[PDB]
Amino acid sequence: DIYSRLLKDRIIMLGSQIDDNVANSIVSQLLFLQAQDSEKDIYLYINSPGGSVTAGFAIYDTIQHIKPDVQTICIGMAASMGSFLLAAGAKGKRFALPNAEVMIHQPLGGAQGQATEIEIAANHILKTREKLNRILSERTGQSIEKIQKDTDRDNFLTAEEAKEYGLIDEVMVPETK
Amino acid sequence: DIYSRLLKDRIIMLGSQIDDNVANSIVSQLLFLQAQDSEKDIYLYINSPGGSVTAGFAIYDTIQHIKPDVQTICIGMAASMGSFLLAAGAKGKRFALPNAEVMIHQPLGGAQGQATEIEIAANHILKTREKLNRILSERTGQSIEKIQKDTDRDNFLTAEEAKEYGLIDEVMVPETK
Amino acid sequence: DIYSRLLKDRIIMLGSQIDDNVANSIVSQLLFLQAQDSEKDIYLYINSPGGSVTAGFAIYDTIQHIKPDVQTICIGMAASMGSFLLAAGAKGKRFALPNAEVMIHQPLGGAQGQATEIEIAANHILKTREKLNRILSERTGQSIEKIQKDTDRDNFLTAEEAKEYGLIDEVMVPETK
Amino acid sequence: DIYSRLLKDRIIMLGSQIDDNVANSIVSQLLFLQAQDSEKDIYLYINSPGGSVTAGFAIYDTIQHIKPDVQTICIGMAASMGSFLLAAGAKGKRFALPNAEVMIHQPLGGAQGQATEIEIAANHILKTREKLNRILSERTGQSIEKIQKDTDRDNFLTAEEAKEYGLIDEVMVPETK
Amino acid sequence: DIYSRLLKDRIIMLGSQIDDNVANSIVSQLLFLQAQDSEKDIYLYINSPGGSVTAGFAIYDTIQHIKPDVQTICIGMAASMGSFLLAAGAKGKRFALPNAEVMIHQPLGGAQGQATEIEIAANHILKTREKLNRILSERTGQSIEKIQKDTDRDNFLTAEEAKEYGLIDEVMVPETK
Amino acid sequence: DIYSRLLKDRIIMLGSQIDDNVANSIVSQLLFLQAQDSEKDIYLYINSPGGSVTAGFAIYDTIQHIKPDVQTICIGMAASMGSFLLAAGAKGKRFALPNAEVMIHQPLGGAQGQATEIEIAANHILKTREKLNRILSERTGQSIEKIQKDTDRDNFLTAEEAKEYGLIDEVMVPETK
Amino acid sequence: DIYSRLLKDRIIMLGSQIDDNVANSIVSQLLFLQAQDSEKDIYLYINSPGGSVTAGFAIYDTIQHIKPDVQTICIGMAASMGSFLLAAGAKGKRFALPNAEVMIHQPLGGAQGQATEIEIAANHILKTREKLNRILSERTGQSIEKIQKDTDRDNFLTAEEAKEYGLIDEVMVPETK
Amino acid sequence: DIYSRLLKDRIIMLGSQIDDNVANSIVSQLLFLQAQDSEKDIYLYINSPGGSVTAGFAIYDTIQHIKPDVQTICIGMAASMGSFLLAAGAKGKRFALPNAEVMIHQPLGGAQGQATEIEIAANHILKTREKLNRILSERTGQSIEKIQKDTDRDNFLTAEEAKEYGLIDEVMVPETK
Amino acid sequence: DIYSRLLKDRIIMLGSQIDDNVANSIVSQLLFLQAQDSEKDIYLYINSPGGSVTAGFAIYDTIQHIKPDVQTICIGMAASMGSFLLAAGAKGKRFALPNAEVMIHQPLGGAQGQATEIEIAANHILKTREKLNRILSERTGQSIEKIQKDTDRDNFLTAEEAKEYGLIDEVMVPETK
Ligand SMILES: CC(C)C[C@H](NC(=O)[C@H](Cc1c[nH]c2ccccc12)NC(=O)c1cc(Cl)ccc1Cl)B(O)O
Ligand SMILES: CC(C)C[C@H](NC(=O)[C@H](Cc1c[nH]c2ccccc12)NC(=O)c1cc(Cl)ccc1Cl)B(O)O
Ligand SMILES: CC(C)C[C@H](NC(=O)[C@H](Cc1c[nH]c2ccccc12)NC(=O)c1cc(Cl)ccc1Cl)B(O)O
Ligand SMILES: CC(C)C[C@H](NC(=O)[C@H](Cc1c[nH]c2ccccc12)NC(=O)c1cc(Cl)ccc1Cl)B(O)O
Ligand SMILES: CC(C)C[C@H](NC(=O)[C@H](Cc1c[nH]c2ccccc12)NC(=O)c1cc(Cl)ccc1Cl)B(O)O
Ligand SMILES: CC(C)C[C@H](NC(=O)[C@H](Cc1c[nH]c2ccccc12)NC(=O)c1cc(Cl)ccc1Cl)B(O)O
Ligand SMILES: CC(C)C[C@H](NC(=O)[C@H](Cc1c[nH]c2ccccc12)NC(=O)c1cc(Cl)ccc1Cl)B(O)O
Ligand SMILES: CC(C)C[C@H](NC(=O)[C@H](Cc1c[nH]c2ccccc12)NC(=O)c1cc(Cl)ccc1Cl)B(O)O
Ligand SMILES: CC(C)C[C@H](NC(=O)[C@H](Cc1c[nH]c2ccccc12)NC(=O)c1cc(Cl)ccc1Cl)B(O)O
C-alpha cells in the first residue's frame, strides 16, 4: 500500500537519502521478511543519492547477517552509500537497469573545535575510509589502492562500467520481470 | 506496522537521538512486552548517536527493573548514551554487528546565569559524570579512573574493541538470524 | 497503542513538559480510569522537566479528588512541577527508580507593564509560592521554612535523597515488574 | 478517545484559550449531548486562560439555551472569559477544585486607523464591558459598580474567595468522583 | 551646503516626513534665523507627506511665536501635517507652485490594551482632532463643520482649489524667483 | 567634488530614481544657481528611471519658475518622470545623446481599504493622469488623446523618435562639449 | 551647526526619547555651558515622549546642580520623563508653547526570573515611583497622593492645564523671540 | 566636542555599557590626561549599567596606576561594574548626585561544552567573584562575607545608602558646579 | 585623537579581537613608529581576547623585526593570541597590571569536506600548534611538553602566576605612570 503490497512479494524500496530513520525502516523490513521466511530471496531496489556511513552500515551488516539472499537492483542512481549497498547484494544477484547510474567517491565530513578534537575527527574519518575501501575492494575484486584512487573525487559509471568494475553482476535486459 | 509487527516478536528498534519522547516510547514498549510475557527475552536494537542523560536513565532503569532479559544489539552506531544502553543489556546478551561502531565520551551541557547558578550547574553535571562512570565501571569491568580518562575526548571503538572493552559480549557473525 | 494498551493496565505516562494540553490529557485519563473502576489503583509514571503551575494543579487536584489510589513512579527525572506531582501520589505508593533524578526549586515567571501591574504579578507569584510550599510541607513532613530555603535555587536530589526528604516513600528495586 | 469516551458520560473538556475553533467544538458538543438526552446534566471542565469575547459568548448562550443543566467545574485556572464561563453554569452546580485559580479583569483590545475608526472601536469595547459587567452581576449577586471596580486590573481569587464572590457555589472536596 | 548656503538666504527646506528629528531641525533653523535677524522674512519650502501631530505642533507654534514673517511655499505635495504647516505661514504670504498638490484629512492613530486605556487613547485623539479642526478653520476662513466634513477621508486639492479653500493666498506664477 | 565642482559650471546631475530626497536636492541646486546668477543658463543632465509624481512636479515647477533657461540633456535613459522632466527644459534646449533611450507610460499606484477609499485613490490617480497628459501635450505639440493612447503601455523611443515626438529639440552630435 | 550654533546662545535642544546616550549628551552640554559662564541662564527646549528613568535623573540632578538657571521650554510634547524634566526648570522659568501637550503617567518596566527576583524588581520600581511622585510633588505643589492617582493611567494636559497643574509657570505668547 | 571640550577640563564621561571598546577609550583618555599633567585631578562621571569584568578591570587598574587623583561622580545609575568603578575613585573624592542610583550584584556568565570545560568556567567565575569581593571590601570597609551576602541578588542603593555602605564618600549637593 | 595623540607618545592600543584588519593597523603603526625613530621604545597595550593565528603572527614577527624594543603591557585580559603577543614583548619589558587576567589554551579550528581535505586541515593545525608551543617555550623558559600539557584546556592565570610562568617579567605597581 503501495509498498506494503510489494512487501508481500519480498520487495523493499530504498528510494531516498540513507539516514538513521531510513536505515531503521530498511533493517526492520529485512528482519521481518526473514521472520516470515528465512529461505526465499529478498529483492532490494536502490535509487539513492547516499547518506550516513553508520546508517549505511546498519543496512549492510543486516544484509550480510540474515539467511536469505538479498538481491540488489539499481534503478536510476546509486551513489555514495547507495552504490556501497548495491555492491553488498548476494554475489551473482546484483543488478542495474541499463540506464541506471552508479557513483563512487570517498567519504565527507566535518570537524570543529580544539586542535586535539579536530585530530580525533580526522583520524576517525581516515580509519572509516580505509574500512570502506577494504570492504568495497572485497565486494568488487579490485585492489584497495584502485578503490582509493578511483574514489579520490566523484567517479560516475554507467551500468556497463559498474559491471566491468565488479559493483554489479549483470545489466538487466527487458522482456522479463 | 512495520515496528508494530516486529513488536509481536518482542523486538524494539531504537534508531535515533534519545530525547524524552523516544525514552517514553521505549519505556512503554518495555512495559508492554513484560505485561504480555514476563519470562521471554526482549530484543533491543540500538542505532543511536546518543541523547539526554535523564531520558537515557529512564530507559536504563526500566531495562534493569523488568523481569525479562533485555538483549541489546548494536547495528550501525551506538555513541554516547547509545553505548551506555548497549552496555546495559543482560550480561552475556549484549551484541554488536561486525561493522557497527561504538563511541564513548564524557557528558556535555550548558550553564548561564549568576556565578552561584553556574556553580550549581557545574556541580550537578560533575556528579552526573561520577554516576555514569560508576555504572559503566560496574557494567564493563573497567575501573572508574580508566573510564574517566578514556572518555575525556571522543573514543571510537570497533565492535571487537567494544567486546574487549566489556561494553558487549559477542560480535555477531552471519548465517544466523 | 502503545499508551492505549498501557491505559488498559491503568498505567498513565507523563513524559513531557506540563502545559494545559498535557494537563487536559492526564486529567481525562484519570477521569476515564475512575469511571472504568473506582477501586483499582492507577499507576502514574513521571519523567518531566516541569511546566505550568496551574496546569500542574489541575493534575494535582484531580489526583487527590478521585477515589482510586494513584501511585507515582519517577523514571528519569521529576523536576519542578514534575517533582510536585511525584510527591502527590498516595502516601506509601510514591516511588523512584534507582537512578532517577528529582529536582525542586522556587517558581519562575515574568511581568511587564505599569508599576501597578508589576506589583500585581509579583504579589500573585509570591502567594503562589507560599501555597506550593504549604502543600509540599504537608506531603513531605518538612517545615515550610525549610522548603523555602531548600528551593531558593535549583536543588537536585538522588532517589535516595528524595526518600529521606519525603518526596517519595521507596526506591524501587529490580527483580519485580 | 480519550475525549470521545468521556463525552459518552456527558463530559466536555475546555482546556485551552477560547477562540472561534474552540467555541465551535464546545457548542457542537453541547448541541450533540442535548440531542442525545435533553434531561441529564452536562459536565463542563474548565481550565482556560480566557480568549475572545464573542467566542466566549457563543459558548455562554448555548449553555443558557439548552434544556440540560450544565455543571461547571474549575480545574487549574479559570481566567478572564474562562471565569465568565465558570459563573455561567447552572446555579448550585458551579464548582472549583481546592487549589484551582480564578481570575477576573476587564476586556482588552486594539484599534488602528482614522480618529473616527478609533472612536468606533472604543465605544464598542466600552459597551462590551458594560454587557459583561451586567451579566456577571446577575450571575454573582455583586453590584455592577463593584464588578467595575474589581476588574479594573487583574484580580486573582482562590477557590474559596471565588465562592465568597459568587462565581462558584462550592469548593469540591475529595473522596467523591 | 547645499542647504546651509540656502540658509544664508533665510530659506529652510522641509522636504520629508515630519517626525521629532525633522521638527527639531526646522525649529532650530527658525530660532537661528531670528537670532540672526528678527525682522527679515523667512522662506519655508514644504514638500512633505505629513507626519506626527506633536512634531508638527512644535513647528507650528515656533512659526507663530517668532517675530519674522514666515512665508510658506508648497512645491510638489503638502499633505496632512504638511498642508497644516502650509496654512500656518504669514497670511498673504502662503504660496503653491501651479502643479503642487495639497491634501487634507483627519488624524490617524492606534490604541491597544485594556478597555479603559483604549478609551483614554480615543478621547485624546478626538480632542486632538477638534483642536486641529479649530485651528485650520481659523487659518482658512472656513467653518469648523466644513473642516470636519472635508477631512473625513483623504481630500486632494489642486493649487487653485487650495487658494479657493483658504489654505494658500496665491498660486505662484513663473518668470519671478 | 565632483558634483560640487560641476555646480560652479551650472551643471546639475539627475542620475537616479526621483523621490522626495532627490527632488529636494535638485530644487535646492536650482534655487542656489539662480541665487548666484539669474541670467546664465543651467544644465540639467538626466539619467533616471523615473519616480514619484509629486517629487517630479516639485522639480518641474521649480524649473519653470526660475529665471534662467534650464537646458535638459538625456544621457542613458529618461523614463517615466525622467522623460517628463526632459520635456520640461527650455524650448529649443532639450537634448538627447545619440544612444539615449526615452520611455513614456501612464502612472502607476496602489490603494487598499474600504470601497470608498479605493474610489478616492482611483479618482485621484486618474485626475493626475489627465494633468500629466495635458502638460506633456503643451510641451510636445501632440494632442492629449494621442498621449493617452501612446502611454497606455510602456512606449520606448529612440533619441530620434523622441525628437520627432516633440519631447526634445535636437539629438546632440559629438565634436562639441 | 545647527545645534552647535544654538549652543553659542546657551540653547540645548532635547528632541527625542531619553536614553543613556541622549542623557550624556545633555549632561555634557549643561557642563559645557556652566564652564563658559556660570552666571547666564541656559535654555532647554523639550520635545520628548519620555525615556529611561535613570537617564532622566542624570539630566535632572545636573540641572539642579549647576549654578546657572535652566529654563525649560516645551514645544510639541513633553510626555513621561519629558514632563518630569519640564517641571525641573528654574521656578518661574518653565514654559510651554500654546499648542504643546504635556502628559504624565506612572513608570513602566519588566521583570522575569524566579519569584524572589521578580519581588526584587517589583520593590525597586515601586520605590522608584514613590521617589518620582515625591519630587514631582515638590516641583508642582500637588500632594503625593494626588500625583499617585493622576498618573495611574495616561493623563494628557494642555499648556494651560500644565500651568494650573504646577508643571510650568507660563504659557508662551507670540511676538516675543 | 562636546566630550573633547570637556576633556580639556580633565572631565571623562563614562555613559554606557562597559565593553572592550569603551574600556579602551576610557584608558586612553586617562593615559592622555596624565601625559598632559601628572598632578591635576581627573573627573570621571559614571552613568553605566555595567559591563565586562575584564574591561572594567582595565579601567580600574589604570585608575589606580596613574598619578592624578581620579574623582568619580555617579549621575543617574552606577550598577554592577559601574558601581565597582565608582568605588574605585580616590578616597574622599567619590561622589553621587542626590537622585542617582547604585546597584551591586554578583557576576553573571555562561558555559557550554564538556563537563570538564563547564567545571573550568565555573571555577574561573567563582575565583573572579572572590577577587571582586576582596577588592570591594578594601574600597568600602565592609567585610568580604557581608559583600558576599549583599550581592547574592540585585541590591539597589540610594545615594545616601551608598555613602553609608562605603561605595562613595559624599552626596553632592547643589549651588556648586 | 584620542589614539593618534597617544601614538605620538609611541603608544599603541590593542583592545579587540585580533583579525586581519586589526593586525594591519597594528603592523602599520609599528612600521610608522620605527620610521619616525628607530631607537626609542614602543608601548603596546594589550586587552584582547585573542583571534586569528596568522593575524597574530603578522603582529608577532613585526615586533621581532623592527629595531625598537616593544614593551607589552597587559590591561584587563590577554587571552589566547593576546597572551602570545604579551610574551612577545622585549624581555624585561613585559608587564601586566595587578588585576589583569592571562589565559593560554590550544588553537581551535574547523574543517569540512572530503576525508583528504579534513586530513590536510588537521595536519596543518597540529603543525601550527607545535609551532606555537615552540615559540612560547623560547619566550617563557618552559618546556614544550609543559606548554603542551598546560594548554590542553583553557588555563587562566593571575598576573602573578603569569610572572611565575614566564609570560611577563613584572607586575606593574602604582605611584608611577
Ligand atoms: C563514501 C560513501 C560510502 C559515504 C558518504 N557518506 C559520508 O561521506 C559521511 C558519513 C560520515 C562518516 N564519517 C563522518 C564524520 C563526520 C561526519 C560525517 C561522517 N557523511 C555524510 O554524508 C554526512 C555528513 C554530515 Cl557533516 C552530516 C550528515 C551526513 Cl549523511 B555518501 O555521500 O553517501
Ligand atoms: C556521556 C553520555 C552518556 C551522554 C551525552 N548526553 C549529555 O552529555 C547531556 C545530558 C545532560 C546531563 N547534564 C546536563 C546539564 C545541562 C545540559 C545537558 C545535560 N546533554 C546533552 O547531550 C544535551 C545538552 C543540551 Cl544543552 C541539550 C540537550 C541535550 Cl540531549 B550524549 O552525547 O549522548
Ligand atoms: C516551582 C515549580 C513547582 C513550578 C515551575 N513552574 C513555574 O515556575 C511558573 C508557572 C507560573 C506560576 N506563576 C506564574 C506567573 C507568571 C508566569 C508563569 C507563572 N511558570 C513557568 O514555568 C512558565 C513561565 C512563563 Cl513566563 C511561561 C510559561 C511557563 Cl510554564 B517549574 O519550572 O515547573
Ligand atoms: C474580560 C474577559 C471576559 C475577556 C478577555 N477577552 C478580551 O478582552 C477581548 C475580546 C474582544 C472584545 N472586544 C474586542 C475589541 C477588539 C479586540 C478584541 C476584543 N480580546 C482578546 O482577548 C483578544 C484581543 C486581540 Cl487584539 C486579539 C485576540 C484576542 Cl482573543 B480575556 O482576556 O479572556
Ligand atoms: C491630520 C494631520 C494634520 C496629521 C496626521 N498625523 C497623525 O494623524 C497622527 C499623530 C497622532 C495624533 N494623535 C495620535 C495618537 C496615537 C498615535 C498617533 C497620533 N499620527 C501619525 O501620523 C502616526 C501614527 C503612529 Cl501609530 C505612528 C507615527 C505617526 Cl506619524 B498626518 O498624516 O500628517
Ligand atoms: C507617468 C510618470 C510620469 C510617473 C510614474 N510615477 C507614478 O506612476 C506614481 C506616483 C503616483 C501618482 N499617484 C499615485 C498614487 C498612488 C501611488 C503612487 C502614485 N507612483 C510610483 O511610481 C510609485 C508607486 C508606489 Cl505604490 C510607491 C512609490 C512610487 Cl514612486 B513613473 O514610473 O516614473
Ligand atoms: C514615569 C516617567 C517619569 C518615566 C517613564 N520611564 C519608565 O517608565 C521606565 C524606566 C524604568 C524604571 N524602572 C524600571 C524597571 C525595569 C525597566 C525599566 C524601568 N522604563 C521605560 O520606559 C523602559 C522600560 C524598558 Cl523594559 C526598557 C527601556 C525603558 Cl526606557 B516614561 O515613559 O518616560
Ligand atoms: C558583578 C559585576 C562587578 C560585573 C557584572 N559583569 C559580569 O557579571 C560578567 C563578566 C564575566 C566575568 N566572568 C565571566 C565568565 C564568562 C562570561 C562573562 C564573565 N559578564 C557579563 O556581564 C557578560 C556575560 C556574557 Cl555571557 C557576555 C557579555 C557580558 Cl558583559 B555586571 O553585570 O556588570
Ligand atoms: C592558541 C592561540 C595562540 C590562538 C587562538 N586562535 C585560533 O585558535 C585559530 C586560528 C587558526 C589557526 N589554524 C586554523 C585553522 C582553521 C581555522 C582557524 C585556525 N582560529 C580562531 O580563533 C578562528 C577559527 C575560525 Cl573557524 C574562524 C575565525 C577564527 Cl579567529 B585564539 O583563541 O586566540
UniProtKB/Swiss-Prot annotation, chains A, B, C, D, E, F, G, H, I:
Cellular-component GO terms for this entry: cytoplasm; endopeptidase Clp complex
Matches recorded under InterPro entries: ClpP, ClpP/crotonase-like_dom_sf, ClpP/TepA, ClpP_His_AS, ClpP_Ser_AS
Keywords: Cytoplasm, Hydrolase, Protease, Serine protease
GO molecular-function term, one example from the UniProt record: serine-type endopeptidase activity
Reactions that this protein is recorded to catalyse: Hydrolysis of proteins to small peptides in the presence of ATP and magnesium. alpha-casein is the usual test substrate. In the absence of ATP, only oligopeptides shorter than five residues are hydrolyzed (such as succinyl-Leu-Tyr-|-NHMec, and Leu-Tyr-Leu-|-Tyr-Trp, in which cleavage of the -Tyr-|-Leu- and -Tyr-|-Trp bonds also occurs)
Catalytic-site annotation from UniProt: 80 (nucleophile), 105
EC number: 3.4.21.92
Record note on quaternary structure: Fourteen ClpP subunits assemble into 2 heptameric rings which stack back to back to give a disk-like structure with a central cavity, resembling the structure of eukaryotic proteasomes.
HAMAP family xrefs: ClpP (MF_00444)
Protein name, as recorded: ATP-dependent Clp protease proteolytic subunit
Organism: Staphylococcus aureus (strain bovine RF122 / ET3-1)
Gene: clpP
